[PDB]
Symmetry: C5
């Protein structure tokens, strides 16, 4: 993930031009090899035309270039790129939204699984660790970075997400399918046990716990579904073939022909196709957006930081359900206890935001006539 | 389903070019027959023009080719293809999301339907089998592969999803409509019976069971609705007619005319329309995306693996509610019990991900002046 | 509703060409009258130009045709058609999704409203009949076919959806607005009465009943809202005017001028504008998609089969809550009771689906080095 | 709101041409002044060119017209209009969906707030009046028509939505922000009181009431948010500037130049730009769609009938919770009590809908061979 | 936020032209510097061509201008701008919808946390202050204005959102990640304590409180996610590069060449490219829409008024849970108690809205024949 939100907080004169100077996760980094290859092919053709071909061969080459320039149709490429990249970007954001987060479960556990003793600590920590273990299993299934961090269930166990007895049961389960749901079933059974023991004080609390567990498990399954059901290969190949056909048409028909021959629209020999290179940059980077976002769980600069998410989720859930359980500050009157209204102060840099009228609605400036306001 | 997620984990220099070498679920496999037919018609016209037609007939043919080349308008067909294919692909993903999954129900059943004895096992297994049976009935109603696997209710019974007594009741039900909902009503009645017997310990647990059952049944009904309400036939015919009109215009107007006649834009005779074939590949494959995805329950390479889903769902649900019921490892202290913080180790291949700054928010680099930070 | 899902189960060489041979719900059926009118106007103009006009009048007509051919712009009409038709299609699918279905309510009623006696039967049947009656009232308010089937509340009463005493109360209610919600209020009161009498055994069951009732009533209200708030008339008129302007431009500028005059792009007299007719078919059918889908409750071939839905819903709900109440087969061990795993058999036509690798995730082929897998 | 759903129930030969004859909420009504102004400017320029300019001035004017006709690019304005109008239309429908409706609340209140006496009547009526009062306050904040109907809280009180003591408390509340949420807080407190008194018989019923109250209040707040956060002014100005630039380009470059000068594409002088006027109608009406829908709470013909909605909601909720409370017809056997199946009769106008095959699924015509149907 | 909803309440003849006269949040304010720079570059090139270049240099410059004018393709930039800006606008509205609002929580707290004494006041105020504190922490993490108002946790404490003891606990929490969730966990613990003490009278009320807390915390986390996961930098750079390439092509190829040279389409020398400047305004403002909306938490005129939202939320929640707790007006009969129907009066300005027919449905004008209405 390359974050530049602070750089674009305000619409400034520099604007996106300063973003054009960025390298990590950038179009230059994604596309310089392809640009070099395209330029190499173009320059090889140009050198052959200028120095190798005979006169008749050059005439035939000019005819071919003129013919091929007619098929540099950019409009269908723009259509298909726009639709395909929009679909890829929407799927990418949906995939991010499908990442399982333990915050709701940790709030529910801290509020419903009780006991300051070691047994209550064990219950809360084990439930949160089950959620984290399901997340780790699905993430090592779907993400290359997470798999590299946890290449084996031995690595998962030695990392602390799974214990040895839990690993024994996990391996003894007879299933040829991915077992990311097993810690969720463990969570359900443990919540039932805690309710039976009275650690969970009410059936409504148990129901809330199971509902949040099902939300978390559904997000894990959503990640699995996104990993399994790829964007249609036929669609991807169609867009790639369209872009490559346009690039071939440009590679042939954008050659600079001899101005002495007096061809229409061929009277300047720049020896470098600046605008063709810019168009290649535009379209190839437009496809590179989809190339980077199609699997957001790889190791691209703009891919999701799944290992950081794992670390943060586990640490935060453990803190919330162990260190912060029943650890409230004593109830005390707030600063605005005696004040009928309430408003925090403003700094010198933000006091200008005051004196802006408080929006009440858009209809409070009509100022009707007195005769009109009387009811029938 | 053709999965290439691993191949596109990272945006590499090879990129989608390597995907262009794939055959299963590919544009080549979907389109080579149509490409051959188009090339055959084009070459038949070319051979007739070159060898059969007289001089006057060739002059008339050249006039016709010039006239027909004017109507090879690619922009409108690009418009209609983009919109129609976007609709089809969104509907395809929605159809995948409407597939009934037993994971939520199996978690709820394992957590709420109690008893280690044979009666509790029977209750849990029968509830999960009812869910699986509803899924099987709707899938054999909507999917050709599932129907071929279960051509008869006799096949469904012999597969174990239905018992003989359940089949007797199912057949004795008097309805002229599809009976995929019958196992869901059975599930509801059985859950009520289990709550009455005390196997389900609370009304909240019963309510959660019925809510998850209704979600599952709603997904089954959504599959039925997608099977029934097709994409509008008028829309499909409109896009097909537009594409075929463009292809006819190209078939006539992309013929190579005699360069001796000196027609404008007709001075090169390649004898093979490379760019016309590439445009045909692009547009025909763009339509083939919708052709393959319009019914994702057929037997195309990119269609959903519904039989695999049935097997996985039944096996996993049976495991979760029978083998793993009340089968937790003994509660034990985790690896980070004494550690105030927590972080799993990193491998050599992933330790580079560390030292990346931990994102706290985009506003924590502003560095205001001292005078500005003072409250009013 | 015209269903062709089976015809497009697989992407085949025939593909959508076979769909082009369909008549019911087809572009030909929707558009042959308009095509005939367009061809008649074009042929009248052509005949006048060929046989009636003098030489000077023909010269002026040729100038007018050349002028008008410049305004046959395809991109703007394609744009507006694409956006408007996409909006109409999305709204049409949303309208289908807003159809009230009694399946969730019938499952809840079968699981929560108890009693094998006549009073329990009356309670369940009356609740489901109230849901069906609300559906019938809203459907006769919004659908021409349903209104033709139930032109009067007397027709509704003799149909069995409403009783005579219920009709007395319904008409004695003093409201100038549509009363489709009245059976939902009756449902709420009857559920409260059943809970008070102990037929509903728990407050959670009553809450679930009321939640599903509110979902059903919300769907009925959504149907009313879609019926009331039409697609903006200004938008519809804009798209119609754009299409008609393009068609007028074509009607004038696509006339075949005398080749003897030697006009640019006018040297062939086909006497039949094949490509203009194809473009008219394309655009007029594209608009006919929206014309058919704008009100999906009419009597078009692709409109929703609301009367069939009413019949199916009532029959299925009555079966579920009366015939199938507490009518379960005796709990018996399933076929895979002793089997640790489970997999239903495959037929000869589907056994090829086996031997396909079971997808575990996309990261399980990385095969890291031994040195890279060691934790820090 | 201009409703034409009945006119477009079926896709007929007349189709949208009949809609072209409508005046209320029409493009003609929205656009005739702008069309007149455009025609006046064009005619003033044409008259000056024909009768005022000298020969050299006419030559310069012809050069200017030819130059300006090059910039009448309709493609970009089509893009920007399509995207902007699609955004506006989607936002408009979302705004309609955000209108607070009391149907769910009235069903819950009639089912959960009990007592046939004056106190129970007071409880139910006061809860529904609180919901209606919140709706009225937000609607008079966001809608010009509702503000004109209720210009003052005195008008709101005298209309019956608020009492005098409630107004005393409402004005005694010290808040500089809009107080539409105050009746919702009153609703919450009153529901708590009713549960405490036993009028609400269960905590689950109280929870359902509070959930529906929160849904209603969320809809009110969403209306406030839509009123506050307008469509970006920069976006609106961009689309307006693009349309006006295109119209200026047309106003200059669509002038009819003297045919005697023999300019290319200038040889016919129609004295009236029919196609330019049609293009102006198309594009200006396309923008007028967004102009009308951007604030759907004004007084346009296609704006929402908010006062009608207020009247209907109040009347219907009052009926539902007061007149219809515990007023059910005696439970009686329905028409299909003894019938195993059920189907309402069909009229002569709809009996043709029968004999259509009952859809069972798309896979029930495969007709496999006997050999293929045997399990492995 | 710049609100102009009242200005566009109705579609008037002035319409968006009056909006074109606005300055705050306007395209002029966002774009005048870039317009000046573009005009300066164009005028520098024009002055060099007119006064500095020799004759041969001017001939080469004219050839270069003619060459570069061919690459001023507006269609690709139109596509990419439309798609990218649509994505940005949708994401911007989603970000606004992700703003945490305390209204649902305050209603639930006022209805469920009981006690008129100081302890009940403390409970309600502390719960709402915890919600407000979570909102403040996430907003100072994601919004530049909120960070400038609260540059330090010392500022947060001195503003009254956090107490000193709560600050001690907050800082003693050992976490390297953002702690916006800590007040939510405090809320959960305090709600559990209140239920244990009997201040919360039922487990259902506690569950509702925890559900609304989870919704609020989810919105806070969604704000964090939007702040972290920026719009892809590759996509932003692609659109910027495309726009800049088009602007460079225009800067070169829109130069006014000497009319004496008699170049095609170069015969008028206006010395000011009015239409090129209008196109620059159009496209640059279209991108400036995304530039302003990409981070809606900066300090642009159209950015969200987050400090105002903080003030309003805290003040309103404090009022609702402290001043308005158990402070209802005495239950009294409403104005329409004796009236079977109900309708509030209309003013003179709105009485015209009456006499509009009350919409009952679109099917109530069919008027079938007597023979057709008879049941079969
Ligand atoms: Ca901003
Ligand atoms: Ca990637
Ligand atoms: Ca298929
Ligand atoms: Ca219709
Ligand atoms: Ca309006
Ligand atoms: Cl609940």
């Amino acid at each position: 993930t390359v974050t530049y939100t602070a750089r674009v907080a305000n619409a400034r004169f520099g604007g996106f031009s300063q973003l054009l100077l960025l390298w990590r996760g950038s179009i230059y980094k994604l596309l310089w090899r392809e640009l070099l290859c395209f330029l190499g092919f173009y320059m090889a053709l140009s050198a052959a035309y200028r120095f190798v071909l005979t006169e008749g061969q050059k005439r035939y080459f000019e005819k071919l270039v003129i013919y091929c320039d007619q098929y540099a149709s950019l409009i269908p490429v723009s259509f298909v790129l726009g639709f395909y990249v929009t679909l890829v970007v929407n799927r990418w954001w949906s995939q991010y939204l499908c990442m399982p987060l333990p915050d709701a479960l940790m709030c529910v556990v801290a509020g419903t699984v009780h006991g300051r003793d070691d047994r209550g600590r064990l219950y809360r920590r084990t439930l949160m660790r089950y959620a984290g273990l399901s997340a780790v299993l699905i993430l090592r299934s779907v993400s290359t970075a997470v798999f590299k961090r946890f290449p084996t269930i031995d690595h998962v166990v030695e990392a602390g997400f799974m214990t040895r007895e839990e690993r024994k049961k996990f391996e003894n389960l007879n299933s040829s399918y991915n077992k990311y749901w097993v810690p969720c079933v463990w969570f359900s059974n443990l919540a039932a046990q805690a309710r039976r023991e009275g650690r969970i004080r009410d059936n409504s609390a148990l129901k809330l716990l199971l509902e949040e567990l099902n939300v978390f498990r559904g997000k894990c399954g959503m990640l699995f579904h996104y990993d399994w059901i790829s964007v249609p290969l036929v669609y991807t190949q169609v867009v790639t073939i369209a872009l490559y056909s346009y690039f071939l048409a440009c590679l042939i028909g954008r050659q600079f022909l001899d101005p002495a021959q007096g061809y229409k629209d061929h009277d300047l020999d720049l020896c470098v196709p600046i605008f063709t290179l810019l168009q290649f940059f535009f379209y190839a980077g437009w496809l590179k957006v989809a190339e980077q976002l199609i699997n957001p769980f790889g190791e691209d600069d703009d891919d999701f930081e799944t290992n950081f998410l794992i670390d943060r989720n586990f640490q935060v859930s453990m803190l919330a359900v162990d260190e912060m359980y029943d650890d409230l500050a004593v109830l005390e009157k707030d600063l605005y206890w005696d004040a009928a209204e309430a408003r925090a102060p403003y700094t010198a840099a933000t006091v200008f935001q005051l004196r802006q009228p408080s929006f009440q609605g858009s209809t409070f400036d009509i100022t009707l006539a007195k005769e009109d306001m009387q009811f029938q």
